[PDB]
Design a protein around this ligand. Sequence first.
Ligand SMILES: [Cu+]
Ligand SMILES: [Cu+]
Ligand SMILES: [Cu+]
Ligand SMILES: [Cu+]
Ligand SMILES: [Cu+]
Ligand SMILES: [Cu+]
Ligand SMILES: [Cu+]
Ligand SMILES: [Cu+]
Ligand SMILES: [Cu+]
Ligand SMILES: [Cu+]
Ligand SMILES: [Cu+]
Ligand SMILES: [Cu+]
Ligand SMILES: [Cu+]
Ligand SMILES: [Cu+]
Ligand SMILES: [Cu+]
Ligand SMILES: [Cu+]
Ligand SMILES: [Cu+]
Ligand SMILES: [Cu+]
Ligand SMILES: [Cu+]
Ligand SMILES: [Cu+]
Ligand SMILES: [Cu+]
Ligand SMILES: [Cu+]
Ligand SMILES: [Cu+]
Ligand SMILES: [Cu+]
Ligand SMILES: [Cu+]
Ligand SMILES: [Cu+]
Ligand SMILES: [Cu+]
Ligand SMILES: [Cu+]
Ligand SMILES: [Cu+]
Ligand SMILES: [Cu+]
Ligand SMILES: [Cu+]
Ligand SMILES: [Cu+]
Ligand SMILES: [Cu+]
Ligand SMILES: [Cu+]
Ligand SMILES: [Cu+]
Ligand SMILES: [Cu+]
Ligand SMILES: [Cu+]
Ligand SMILES: [Cu+]
Ligand SMILES: [Cu+]
Ligand SMILES: [Cu+]
Ligand SMILES: [Cu+]
Ligand SMILES: [Cu+]
Ligand SMILES: [Cu+]
Ligand SMILES: [Cu+]
Ligand SMILES: [Cu+]
Ligand SMILES: [Cu+]
Ligand SMILES: [Cu+]
Ligand SMILES: [Cu+]
Ligand SMILES: [Cu+]
Ligand SMILES: [Cu+]
Ligand SMILES: [Cu+]
Ligand SMILES: [Cu+]
Ligand SMILES: [Cu+]
Ligand SMILES: [Cu+]
Ligand SMILES: [Cu+]
Ligand SMILES: [Cu+]
Ligand SMILES: [Cu+]
Ligand SMILES: [Cu+]
Ligand SMILES: [Cu+]
Ligand SMILES: [Cu+]
Ligand SMILES: [Cu+]
Ligand SMILES: [Cu+]
Ligand SMILES: [Cu+]
Ligand SMILES: [Cu+]
Ligand SMILES: [Cu+]
Ligand SMILES: [Cu+]
Ligand SMILES: [Cu+]
Ligand SMILES: [Cu+]
Ligand SMILES: [Cu+]
Ligand SMILES: [Cu+]
Ligand SMILES: [Cu+]
Ligand SMILES: [Cu+]
Ligand SMILES: [Cu+]
Ligand SMILES: [Cu+]
Ligand SMILES: [Cu+]
Ligand SMILES: [Cu+]
Lengths: 116, 116, 116, 116
Amino acid sequence: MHVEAMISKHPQSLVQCVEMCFDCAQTCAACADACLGEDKVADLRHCIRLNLDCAEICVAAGSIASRSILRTMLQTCAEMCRMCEEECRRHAGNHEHCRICADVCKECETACRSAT
Amino acid sequence: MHVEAMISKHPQSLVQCVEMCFDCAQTCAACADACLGEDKVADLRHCIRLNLDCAEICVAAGSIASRSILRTMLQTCAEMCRMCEEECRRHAGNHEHCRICADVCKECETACRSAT
Amino acid sequence: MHVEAMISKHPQSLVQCVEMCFDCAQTCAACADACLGEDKVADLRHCIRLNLDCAEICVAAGSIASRSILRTMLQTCAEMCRMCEEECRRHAGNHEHCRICADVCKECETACRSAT
Amino acid sequence: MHVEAMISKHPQSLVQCVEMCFDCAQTCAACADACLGEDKVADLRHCIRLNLDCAEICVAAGSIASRSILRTMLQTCAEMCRMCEEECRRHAGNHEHCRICADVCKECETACRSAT
Ligand SMILES: [Cu+]
Ligand SMILES: [Cu+]
Ligand SMILES: [Cu+]
Ligand SMILES: [Cu+]
Ligand SMILES: [Cu+]
Ligand SMILES: [Cu+]
Ligand SMILES: [Cu+]
Ligand SMILES: [Cu+]
Ligand SMILES: [Cu+]
Ligand SMILES: [Cu+]
Ligand SMILES: [Cu+]
Ligand SMILES: [Cu+]
Ligand SMILES: [Cu+]
Ligand SMILES: [Cu+]
Ligand SMILES: [Cu+]
Ligand SMILES: [Cu+]
Ligand SMILES: [Cu+]
Ligand SMILES: [Cu+]
Ligand SMILES: [Cu+]
Ligand SMILES: [Cu+]
Ligand SMILES: [Cu+]
Ligand SMILES: [Cu+]
Ligand SMILES: [Cu+]
Ligand SMILES: [Cu+]
Ligand SMILES: [Cu+]
Ligand SMILES: [Cu+]
Ligand SMILES: [Cu+]
Ligand SMILES: [Cu+]
Ligand SMILES: [Cu+]
Ligand SMILES: [Cu+]
Ligand SMILES: [Cu+]
Ligand SMILES: [Cu+]
Ligand SMILES: [Cu+]
Ligand SMILES: [Cu+]
Ligand SMILES: [Cu+]
Ligand SMILES: [Cu+]
Ligand SMILES: [Cu+]
Ligand SMILES: [Cu+]
Ligand SMILES: [Cu+]
Ligand SMILES: [Cu+]
Ligand SMILES: [Cu+]
Ligand SMILES: [Cu+]
Ligand SMILES: [Cu+]
Ligand SMILES: [Cu+]
Ligand SMILES: [Cu+]
Ligand SMILES: [Cu+]
Ligand SMILES: [Cu+]
Ligand SMILES: [Cu+]
Ligand SMILES: [Cu+]
Ligand SMILES: [Cu+]
Ligand SMILES: [Cu+]
Ligand SMILES: [Cu+]
Ligand SMILES: [Cu+]
Ligand SMILES: [Cu+]
Ligand SMILES: [Cu+]
Ligand SMILES: [Cu+]
Ligand SMILES: [Cu+]
Ligand SMILES: [Cu+]
Ligand SMILES: [Cu+]
Ligand SMILES: [Cu+]
Ligand SMILES: [Cu+]
Ligand SMILES: [Cu+]
Ligand SMILES: [Cu+]
Ligand SMILES: [Cu+]
Ligand SMILES: [Cu+]
Ligand SMILES: [Cu+]
Ligand SMILES: [Cu+]
Ligand SMILES: [Cu+]
Ligand SMILES: [Cu+]
Ligand SMILES: [Cu+]
Ligand SMILES: [Cu+]
Ligand SMILES: [Cu+]
Ligand SMILES: [Cu+]
Ligand SMILES: [Cu+]
Ligand SMILES: [Cu+]
Ligand SMILES: [Cu+]
């Protein structure tokens, strides 16, 4: 990622938040698709949905963070990540993709809470 | 828009919120580009930035609203729209694109506040 | 939508393309969620996936169209819409949400092909 | 990034493409804002615009790549990155943010061309 490089070269920490929003975005988008592909998919609906929302909010939060609504947006992104960690945590026993994503969600929650 | 058609045919008002999020998304994306094209662009930086953020948040809010983080997300989208109305309102005298967008922002703010 | 209002007030048809990209975006996002909620969800995986991709591409295509990659992007958005119409058409007999979305996809395909 | 972790744990190289799409997304979003903040902003309009489009296409391309339109989408994302490298390359002498972003664009172009 080039968050740090770019944030020092602009004419006018948070770095961690941005790295993580894009990381967590990609990851939940991956997890939605993985859950969608499972045989027990019918049981994963809420998880897929949350993953889709967490992807969307993290892209949004990370783009904004790359440029104020930011405080608010990072609170929201923190709330979302937590919702999505909790759900992805449930499935961590049976699905390795939800262990991986649940931890990425945890780390991005942390990162949004301390950015505010 | 087909928000209303689709929301009645799902196996499990808010309609207005969704219509407006996508409307206001496109509009602020249009306004960012219009301000970017102005001769007084150097004076419009904050407005362009807000427009970009309002586009991003409204897509995000509208997608989520099409599928919970929703309450929170709609509060955030309400806060953003207001921020962006206020700024786009400043420029309504001189720029017709900011009159149009400032009103779209007002109407979407309204719509998010009453969706919550 | 305010595509037409805004495109006439910028300091520097396609309108139909933009209206439709945002319409079709919201619609496929709605259809993904509707299919996700079906009992036969396990059979709808490819459709949900395509709907997610068509939502993403249409937002992208519509934002770009609101501001060149445009020709290319509209070809891609045309290809996607067609892929997603074809799949959503399959399910039009059994699911009213896929009849609605399959037609929105058809109309946006048309609109991208004639924008190029 | 957790592209690699997740792509091995799904029930059904490209990794490089995805890492890079999200990297290049964040970077061009950063560069748009940096150019927007420059005194010579009036001269950077085309660059800002391209950066905005490259951000949008790369998010889109990376999300899709995380889940077919993919071949097509990656061609488009390759075309965009190149357009945006070329423009960001122009400004590499005077602006360090455009040197950084022009190279991120180059590396993501490469990565999309070999993913296809
Ligand atoms: Cu973040
Ligand atoms: Cu996040
Ligand atoms: Cu985030
Ligand atoms: Cu995530
Ligand atoms: Cu998952
Ligand atoms: Cu899941
Ligand atoms: Cu998630
Ligand atoms: Cu997230
Ligand atoms: Cu988050
Ligand atoms: Cu997250
Ligand atoms: Cu999750
Ligand atoms: Cu899960
Ligand atoms: Cu999972
Ligand atoms: Cu998960
Ligand atoms: Cu996660
Ligand atoms: Cu997850
Ligand atoms: Cu998440
Ligand atoms: Cu976060
Ligand atoms: Cu964050
Ligand atoms: Cu809304
Ligand atoms: Cu809105
Ligand atoms: Cu909104
Ligand atoms: Cu707006
Ligand atoms: Cu504007
Ligand atoms: Cu403006
Ligand atoms: Cu706005
Ligand atoms: Cu907005
Ligand atoms: Cu809003
Ligand atoms: Cu708005
Ligand atoms: Cu505004
Ligand atoms: Cu303005
Ligand atoms: Cu304006
Ligand atoms: Cu405006
Ligand atoms: Cu506005
Ligand atoms: Cu505006
Ligand atoms: Cu707005
Ligand atoms: Cu709204
Ligand atoms: Cu709303
Ligand atoms: Cu379009
Ligand atoms: Cu479309
Ligand atoms: Cu489109
Ligand atoms: Cu669609
Ligand atoms: Cu559907
Ligand atoms: Cu479907
Ligand atoms: Cu679709
Ligand atoms: Cu589409
Ligand atoms: Cu399309
Ligand atoms: Cu479409
Ligand atoms: Cu479809
Ligand atoms: Cu379908
Ligand atoms: Cu359907
Ligand atoms: Cu469908
Ligand atoms: Cu459709
Ligand atoms: Cu559809
Ligand atoms: Cu579609
Ligand atoms: Cu279209
Ligand atoms: Cu189109
Ligand atoms: Cu990529
Ligand atoms: Cu890229
Ligand atoms: Cu890309
Ligand atoms: Cu980029
Ligand atoms: Cu830049
Ligand atoms: Cu630039
Ligand atoms: Cu770029
Ligand atoms: Cu890009
Ligand atoms: Cu690219
Ligand atoms: Cu790129
Ligand atoms: Cu560039
Ligand atoms: Cu540049
Ligand atoms: Cu630059
Ligand atoms: Cu640049
Ligand atoms: Cu770049
Ligand atoms: Cu750039
Ligand atoms: Cu780029
Ligand atoms: Cu790329
Ligand atoms: Cu790529």
